[PDB]
Amino acid sequence: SMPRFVVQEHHARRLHWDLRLEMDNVLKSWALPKGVPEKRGVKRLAIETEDHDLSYIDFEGRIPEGMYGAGEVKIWDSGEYELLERTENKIKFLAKGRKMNGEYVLIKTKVGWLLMKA
């Protein structure tokens, strides 16, 4: 296998979370400066970032300084997910994490992306 996701907590120059979905045979990724919404209706900024390799889904450790993406990476949540809807502008999925669970949607508009919880 079932597709999986991870939410990494990344202690870089700006502390953020990274949501990564196994999708298109890579990790489709978004930075979340304020984290995953944990309550219904809350709208969080999501910043599309470059695809990562599938192997990276289980990574934890320190990205060294001078490297782009420096800082400590820790797994905040992880699990399977079920894809419910997808287009170039919308991804709706059921997350099966310990913290991030139930349905969520990533929304692309002219201003970028948002992440929202059912």
Ligand SMILES: [Mn+2]
């Ligand atoms: Mn990051």
